[PDB]
């Protein structure tokens, strides 16, 4: 059983590597969107405060 | 075979995360720097113009 299913285990390992190859990109893209939104919002609030202070 | 199968998935999942997160860096830095420069621009638009009009 183990020797016969070792081929299936190797195929499943390759499939898991392939699945992780895209999940790594997707999670990083989600974090990118979150961080960019946070930075943009903070700097826009800073810009509004700077406009008032400059007035 | 089990050790090699685990190692393949681990190696596939280890490297790509930092490279994918680097895709964050360009957009997030562009947004943050552009918004800080917009804060500076809002500060500077009033500073010279209001002084000129107040003269």
Swiss-Prot record, chains A, B:
Domain of life: Bacteria
Subcellular location: Cell membrane
Family, as annotated: Belongs to the ATPase B chain family.
Function recorded in the entry: F(1)F(0) ATP synthase produces ATP from ADP in the presence of a proton or sodium gradient. F-type ATPases consist of two structural domains, F(1) containing the extramembraneous catalytic core and F(0) containing the membrane proton channel, linked together by a central stalk and a peripheral stalk. During catalysis, ATP synthesis in the catalytic domain of F(1) is coupled via a rotary mechanism of the central stalk subunits to proton translocation.
Subunit-structure text: F-type ATPases have 2 components, F(1) - the catalytic core - and F(0) - the membrane proton channel. F(1) has five subunits: alpha(3), beta(3), gamma(1), delta(1), epsilon(1). F(0) has four main subunits: a(1), b(2) and c(10-14). The alpha and beta chains form an alternating ring which encloses part of the gamma chain. F(1) is attached to F(0) by a central stalk formed by the gamma and epsilon chains, while a peripheral stalk is formed by the delta and b chains.
Protein name: ATP synthase subunit b
Covered residues, full protein: 56 to 110 of 164
């Amino acid at each position: 059983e183990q020797l016969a299913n070792a081929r299936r285990d190797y195929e499943a390992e390759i499939a898991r590597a392939r699945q992780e190859a895209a999940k790594i990109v997707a999670q990083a893209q989600e974090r990118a969107k979150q961080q960019e939104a946070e930075i943009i919002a903070q700097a826009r609030r800073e810009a509004e405060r700077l406009k008032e202070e400059a007035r």
